[PDB]
mmCIF file of C-alpha atoms in Angstrom:
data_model
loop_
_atom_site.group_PDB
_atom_site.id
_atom_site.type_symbol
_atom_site.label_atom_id
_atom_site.label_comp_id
_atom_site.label_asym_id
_atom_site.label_seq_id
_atom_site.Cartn_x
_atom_site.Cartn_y
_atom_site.Cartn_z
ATOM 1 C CA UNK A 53 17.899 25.150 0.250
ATOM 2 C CA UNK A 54 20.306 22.229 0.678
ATOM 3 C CA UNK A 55 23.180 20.422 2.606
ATOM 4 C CA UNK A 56 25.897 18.416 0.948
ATOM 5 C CA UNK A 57 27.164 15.728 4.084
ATOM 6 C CA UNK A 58 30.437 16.450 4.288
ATOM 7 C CA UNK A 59 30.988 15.007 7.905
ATOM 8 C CA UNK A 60 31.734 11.319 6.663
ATOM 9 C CA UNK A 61 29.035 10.070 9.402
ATOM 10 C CA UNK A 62 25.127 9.929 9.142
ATOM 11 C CA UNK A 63 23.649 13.528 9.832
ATOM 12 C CA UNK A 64 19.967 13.102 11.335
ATOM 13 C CA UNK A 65 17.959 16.200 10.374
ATOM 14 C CA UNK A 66 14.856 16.880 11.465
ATOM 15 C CA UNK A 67 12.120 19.435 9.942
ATOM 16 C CA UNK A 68 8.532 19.945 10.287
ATOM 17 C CA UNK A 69 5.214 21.042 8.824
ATOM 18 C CA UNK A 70 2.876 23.510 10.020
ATOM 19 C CA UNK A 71 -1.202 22.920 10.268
ATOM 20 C CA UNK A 72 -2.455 26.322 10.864
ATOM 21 C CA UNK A 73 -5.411 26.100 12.448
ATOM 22 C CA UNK A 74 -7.553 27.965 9.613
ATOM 23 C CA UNK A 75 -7.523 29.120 6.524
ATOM 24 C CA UNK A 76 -6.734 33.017 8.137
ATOM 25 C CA UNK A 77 -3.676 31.871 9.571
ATOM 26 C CA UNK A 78 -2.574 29.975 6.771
ATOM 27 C CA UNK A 79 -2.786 33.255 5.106
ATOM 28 C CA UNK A 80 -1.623 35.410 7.200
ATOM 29 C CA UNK A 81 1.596 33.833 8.292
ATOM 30 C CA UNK A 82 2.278 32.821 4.707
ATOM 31 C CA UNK A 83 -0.210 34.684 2.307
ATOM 32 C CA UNK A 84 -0.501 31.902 0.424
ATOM 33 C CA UNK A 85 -4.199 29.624 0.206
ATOM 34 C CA UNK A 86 -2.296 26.134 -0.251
ATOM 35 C CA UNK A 87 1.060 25.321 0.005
ATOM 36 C CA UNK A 88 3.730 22.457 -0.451
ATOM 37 C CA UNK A 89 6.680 21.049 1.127
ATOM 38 C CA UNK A 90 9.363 18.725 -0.884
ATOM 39 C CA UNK A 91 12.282 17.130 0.828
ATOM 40 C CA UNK A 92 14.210 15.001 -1.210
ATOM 41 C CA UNK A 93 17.278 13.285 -1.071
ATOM 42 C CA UNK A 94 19.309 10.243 -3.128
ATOM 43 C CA UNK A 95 17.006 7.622 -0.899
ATOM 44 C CA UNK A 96 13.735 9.646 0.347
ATOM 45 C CA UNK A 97 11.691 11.963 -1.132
ATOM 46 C CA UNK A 98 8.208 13.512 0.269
ATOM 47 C CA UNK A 99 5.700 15.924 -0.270
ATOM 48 C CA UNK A 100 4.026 17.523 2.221
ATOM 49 C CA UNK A 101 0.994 19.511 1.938
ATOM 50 C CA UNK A 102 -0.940 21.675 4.925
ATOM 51 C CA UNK A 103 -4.088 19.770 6.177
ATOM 52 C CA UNK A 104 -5.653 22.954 6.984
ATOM 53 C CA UNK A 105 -8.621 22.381 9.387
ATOM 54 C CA UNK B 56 16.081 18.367 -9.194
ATOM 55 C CA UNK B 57 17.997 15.505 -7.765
ATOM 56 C CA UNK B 58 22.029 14.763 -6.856
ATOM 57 C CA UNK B 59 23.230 13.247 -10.153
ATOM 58 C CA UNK B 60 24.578 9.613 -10.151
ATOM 59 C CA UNK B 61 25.232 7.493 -12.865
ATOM 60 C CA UNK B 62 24.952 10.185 -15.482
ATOM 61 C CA UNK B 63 21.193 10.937 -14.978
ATOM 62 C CA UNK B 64 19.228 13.052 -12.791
ATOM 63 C CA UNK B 65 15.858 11.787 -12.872
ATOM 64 C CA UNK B 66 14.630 9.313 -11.448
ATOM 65 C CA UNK B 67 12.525 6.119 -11.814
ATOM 66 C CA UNK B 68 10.703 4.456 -8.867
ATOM 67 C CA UNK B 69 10.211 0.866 -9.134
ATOM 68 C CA UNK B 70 6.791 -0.650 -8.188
ATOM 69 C CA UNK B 71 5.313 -4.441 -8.247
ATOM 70 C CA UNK B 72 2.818 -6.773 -7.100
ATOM 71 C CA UNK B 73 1.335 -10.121 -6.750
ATOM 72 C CA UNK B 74 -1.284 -10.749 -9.285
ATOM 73 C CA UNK B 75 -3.206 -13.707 -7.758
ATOM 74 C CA UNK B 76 -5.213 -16.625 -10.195
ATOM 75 C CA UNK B 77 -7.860 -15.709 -11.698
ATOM 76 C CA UNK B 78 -7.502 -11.717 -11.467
ATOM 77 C CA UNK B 79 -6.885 -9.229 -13.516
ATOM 78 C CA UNK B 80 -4.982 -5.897 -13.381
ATOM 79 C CA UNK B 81 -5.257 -2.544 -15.162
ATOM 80 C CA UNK B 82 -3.063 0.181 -15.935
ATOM 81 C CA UNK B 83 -4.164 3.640 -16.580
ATOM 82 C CA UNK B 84 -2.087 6.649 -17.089
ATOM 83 C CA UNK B 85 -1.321 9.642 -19.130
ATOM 84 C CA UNK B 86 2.192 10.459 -18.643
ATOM 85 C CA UNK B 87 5.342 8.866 -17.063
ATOM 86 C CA UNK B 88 4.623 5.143 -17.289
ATOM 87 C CA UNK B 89 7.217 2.386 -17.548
ATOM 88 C CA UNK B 90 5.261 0.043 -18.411
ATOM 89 C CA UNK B 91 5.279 -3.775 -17.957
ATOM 90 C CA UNK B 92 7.274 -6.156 -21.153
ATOM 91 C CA UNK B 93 7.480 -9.220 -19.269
ATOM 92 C CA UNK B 94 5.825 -11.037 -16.039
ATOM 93 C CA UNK B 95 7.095 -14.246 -14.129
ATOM 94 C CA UNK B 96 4.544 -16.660 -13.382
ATOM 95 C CA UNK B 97 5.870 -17.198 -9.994
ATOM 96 C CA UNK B 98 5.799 -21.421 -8.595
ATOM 97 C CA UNK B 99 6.473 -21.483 -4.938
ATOM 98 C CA UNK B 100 8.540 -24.315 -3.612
ATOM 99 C CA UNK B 101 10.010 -24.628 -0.229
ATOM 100 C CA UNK B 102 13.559 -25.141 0.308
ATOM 101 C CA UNK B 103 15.498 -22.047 -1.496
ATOM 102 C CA UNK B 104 16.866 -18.718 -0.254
ATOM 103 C CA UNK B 105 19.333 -16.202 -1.028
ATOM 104 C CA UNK B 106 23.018 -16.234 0.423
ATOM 105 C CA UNK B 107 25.981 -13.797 -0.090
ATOM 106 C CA UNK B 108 29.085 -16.119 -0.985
ATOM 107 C CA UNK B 109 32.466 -15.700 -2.884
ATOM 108 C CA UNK C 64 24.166 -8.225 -10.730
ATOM 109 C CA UNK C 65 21.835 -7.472 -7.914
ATOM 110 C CA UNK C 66 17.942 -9.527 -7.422
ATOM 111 C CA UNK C 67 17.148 -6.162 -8.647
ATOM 112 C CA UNK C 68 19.029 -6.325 -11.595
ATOM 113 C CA UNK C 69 17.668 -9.779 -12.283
ATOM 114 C CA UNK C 70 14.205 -8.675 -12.016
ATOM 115 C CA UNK C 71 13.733 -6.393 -14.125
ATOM 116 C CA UNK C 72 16.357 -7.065 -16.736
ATOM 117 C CA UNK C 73 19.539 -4.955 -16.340
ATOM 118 C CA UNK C 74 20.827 -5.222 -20.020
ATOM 119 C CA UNK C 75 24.384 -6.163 -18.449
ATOM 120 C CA UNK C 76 23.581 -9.499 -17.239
ATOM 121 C CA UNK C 77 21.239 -11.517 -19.749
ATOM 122 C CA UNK C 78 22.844 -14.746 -18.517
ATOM 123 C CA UNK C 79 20.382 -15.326 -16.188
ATOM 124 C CA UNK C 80 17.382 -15.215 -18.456
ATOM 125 C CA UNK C 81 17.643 -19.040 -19.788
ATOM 126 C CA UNK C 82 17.694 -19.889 -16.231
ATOM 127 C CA UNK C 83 14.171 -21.123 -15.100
ATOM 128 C CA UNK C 84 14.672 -23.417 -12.161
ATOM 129 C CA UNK C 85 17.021 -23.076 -9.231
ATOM 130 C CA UNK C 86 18.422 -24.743 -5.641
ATOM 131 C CA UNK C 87 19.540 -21.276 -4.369
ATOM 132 C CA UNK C 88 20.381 -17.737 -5.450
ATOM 133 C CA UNK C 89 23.746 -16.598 -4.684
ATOM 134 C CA UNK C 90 24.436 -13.057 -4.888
ATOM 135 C CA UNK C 91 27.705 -10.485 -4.586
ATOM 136 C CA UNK C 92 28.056 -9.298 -1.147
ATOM 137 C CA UNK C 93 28.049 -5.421 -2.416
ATOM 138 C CA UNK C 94 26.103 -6.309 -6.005
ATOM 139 C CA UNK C 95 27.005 -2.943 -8.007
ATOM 140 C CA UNK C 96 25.165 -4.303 -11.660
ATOM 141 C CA UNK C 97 21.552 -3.665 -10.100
ATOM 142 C CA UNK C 98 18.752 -0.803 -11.248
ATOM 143 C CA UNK C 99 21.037 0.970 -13.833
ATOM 144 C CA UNK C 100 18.203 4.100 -13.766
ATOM 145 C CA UNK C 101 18.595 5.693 -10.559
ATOM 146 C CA UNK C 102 15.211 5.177 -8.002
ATOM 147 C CA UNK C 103 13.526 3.521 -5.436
ATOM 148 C CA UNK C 104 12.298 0.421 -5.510
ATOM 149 C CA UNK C 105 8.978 -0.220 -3.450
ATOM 150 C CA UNK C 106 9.391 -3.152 -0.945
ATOM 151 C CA UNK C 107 12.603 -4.628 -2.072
ATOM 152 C CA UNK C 108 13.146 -6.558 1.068
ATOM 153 C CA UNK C 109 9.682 -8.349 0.650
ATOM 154 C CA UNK C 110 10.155 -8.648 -2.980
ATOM 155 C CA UNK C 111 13.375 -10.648 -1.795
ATOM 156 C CA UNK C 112 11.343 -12.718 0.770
ATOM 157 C CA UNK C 113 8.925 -13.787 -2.356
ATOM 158 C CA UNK C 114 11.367 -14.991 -4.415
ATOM 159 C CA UNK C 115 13.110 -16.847 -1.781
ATOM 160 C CA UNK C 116 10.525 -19.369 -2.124
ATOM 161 C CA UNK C 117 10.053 -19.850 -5.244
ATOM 162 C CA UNK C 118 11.917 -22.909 -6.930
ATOM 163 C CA UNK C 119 11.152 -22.029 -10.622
ATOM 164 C CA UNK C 120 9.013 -19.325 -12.881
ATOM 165 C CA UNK C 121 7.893 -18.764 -16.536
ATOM 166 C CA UNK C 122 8.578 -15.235 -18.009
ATOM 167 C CA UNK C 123 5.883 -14.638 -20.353
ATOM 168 C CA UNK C 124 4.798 -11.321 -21.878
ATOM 169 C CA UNK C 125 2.595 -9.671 -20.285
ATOM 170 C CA UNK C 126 2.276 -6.514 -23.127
ATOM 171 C CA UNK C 127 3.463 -7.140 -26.582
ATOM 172 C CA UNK C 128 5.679 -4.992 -27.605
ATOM 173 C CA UNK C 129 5.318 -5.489 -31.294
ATOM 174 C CA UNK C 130 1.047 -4.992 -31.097
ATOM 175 C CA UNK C 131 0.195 -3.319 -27.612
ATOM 176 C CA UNK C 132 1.503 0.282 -28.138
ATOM 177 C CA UNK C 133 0.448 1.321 -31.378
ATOM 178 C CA UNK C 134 -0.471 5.136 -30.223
ATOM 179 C CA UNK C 135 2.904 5.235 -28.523
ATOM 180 C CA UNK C 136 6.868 5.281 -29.274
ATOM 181 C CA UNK C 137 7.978 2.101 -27.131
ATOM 182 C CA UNK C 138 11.664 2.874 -27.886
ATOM 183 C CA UNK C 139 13.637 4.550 -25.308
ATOM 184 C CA UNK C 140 17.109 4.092 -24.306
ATOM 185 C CA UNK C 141 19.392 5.739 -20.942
ATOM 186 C CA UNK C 142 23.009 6.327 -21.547
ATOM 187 C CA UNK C 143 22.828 4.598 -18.054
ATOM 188 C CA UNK C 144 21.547 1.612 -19.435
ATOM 189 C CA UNK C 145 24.297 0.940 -22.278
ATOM 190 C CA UNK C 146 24.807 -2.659 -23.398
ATOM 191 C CA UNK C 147 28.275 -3.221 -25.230
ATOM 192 C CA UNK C 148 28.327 1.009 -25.294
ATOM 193 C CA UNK C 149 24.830 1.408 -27.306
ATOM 194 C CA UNK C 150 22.089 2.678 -24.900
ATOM 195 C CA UNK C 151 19.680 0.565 -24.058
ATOM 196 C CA UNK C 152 17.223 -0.221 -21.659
ATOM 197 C CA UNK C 153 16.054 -2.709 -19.334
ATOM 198 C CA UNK C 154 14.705 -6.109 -20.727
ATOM 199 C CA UNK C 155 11.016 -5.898 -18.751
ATOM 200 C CA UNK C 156 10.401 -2.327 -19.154
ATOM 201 C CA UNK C 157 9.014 -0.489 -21.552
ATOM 202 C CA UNK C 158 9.815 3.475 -21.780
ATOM 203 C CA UNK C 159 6.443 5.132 -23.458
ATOM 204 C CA UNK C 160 7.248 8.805 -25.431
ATOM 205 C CA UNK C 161 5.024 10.673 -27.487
ATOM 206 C CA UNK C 162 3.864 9.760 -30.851
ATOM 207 C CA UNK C 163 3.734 12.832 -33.094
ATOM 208 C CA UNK C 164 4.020 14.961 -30.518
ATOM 209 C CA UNK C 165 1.117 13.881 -28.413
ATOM 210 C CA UNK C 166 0.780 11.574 -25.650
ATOM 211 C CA UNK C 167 -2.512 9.893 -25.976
ATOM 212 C CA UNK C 168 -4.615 7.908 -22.464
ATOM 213 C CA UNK C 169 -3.364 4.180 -22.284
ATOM 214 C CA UNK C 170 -5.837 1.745 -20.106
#
């Protein structure tokens, strides 16, 4: 997904990663055994990755 | 994929450091290296800076 | 150009490259000739700080370009990068491609 600032002022947006607490919720909520997150932008870019534990 | 500017859409990230006397440094890589032509041997002096003027 | 563009060679400003020893830098309020290749560049305020204090330095190089590379194609060129229209590159980097279609470790 993605958002092109078209307000002309600074837009804060805030996200967040989920830690299931095991490796049954991670797949049950998501059905997936590891997973990644990637939010980029022109200035900042990050990868997220569960820390599962 | 990233927003285009300047007629390219990937991107390089810039990296550097302070190699002190007597030291050496090592690159390794397999892919995606921009690798190092020319160094500065850096002599520190006091009385300098760096001013925005017209 | 930018302290950016200084550093690492923006083929649009070679000017500064005779220029060893110094008083002061003076740069453009809003530089626009800085990293032609779009990116970040790690701790550009500090980098700034360093060279601050630093009345004079000796560019020297560091990797051949002639005899370092011999398992690689050190020729690459960004129509960002264009000196007098030709692509080009910046003056302290080196882009590394393929050799006969394989990429071989470098260390």
């Amino acid at each position: 997904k993605s958002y092109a600032n078209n307000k002309e002022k600074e837009v804060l947006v805030l996200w967040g990663v989920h830690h299931p607490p095991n490796i049954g919720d991670q797949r049950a909520l998501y059905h997936k055994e590891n997973a990644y997150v990637s939010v980029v932008s022109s200035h900042y870019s990050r990868k997220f990755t569960p820390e599962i534990a | 994929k990233r927003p285009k500017v300047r007629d390219q859409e990937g991107r390089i990230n810039y990296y550097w450091t302070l190699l002190e006397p007597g030291d050496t440094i090592i690159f390794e890589a397999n892919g995606n290296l921009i690798a190092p032509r020319y160094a500065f041997a850096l002599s520190r002096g006091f009385g300098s800076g760096i001013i925005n003027s017209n | 150009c930018s302290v950016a563009g200084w550093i690492l060679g923006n083929p649009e400003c070679e000017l500064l490259i005779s220029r060893e020893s110094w008083s002061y830098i003076v740069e453009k309020p809003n530089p626009e000739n800085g990293t032609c290749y779009p990116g970040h560049f790690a701790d550009y305020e500090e980098l700034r700080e360093q060279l601050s204090s630093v009345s004079s330095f000796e560019r020297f190089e560091i990797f051949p370009k002639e005899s370092s590379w011999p398992n690689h194609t050190t020729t690459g060129v960004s129509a960002s990068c264009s000196h007098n229209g030709e692509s080009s590159f910046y003056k302290n980097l080196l882009w590394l491609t393929g050799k006969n279609g394989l990429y071989p470790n470098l260390s």
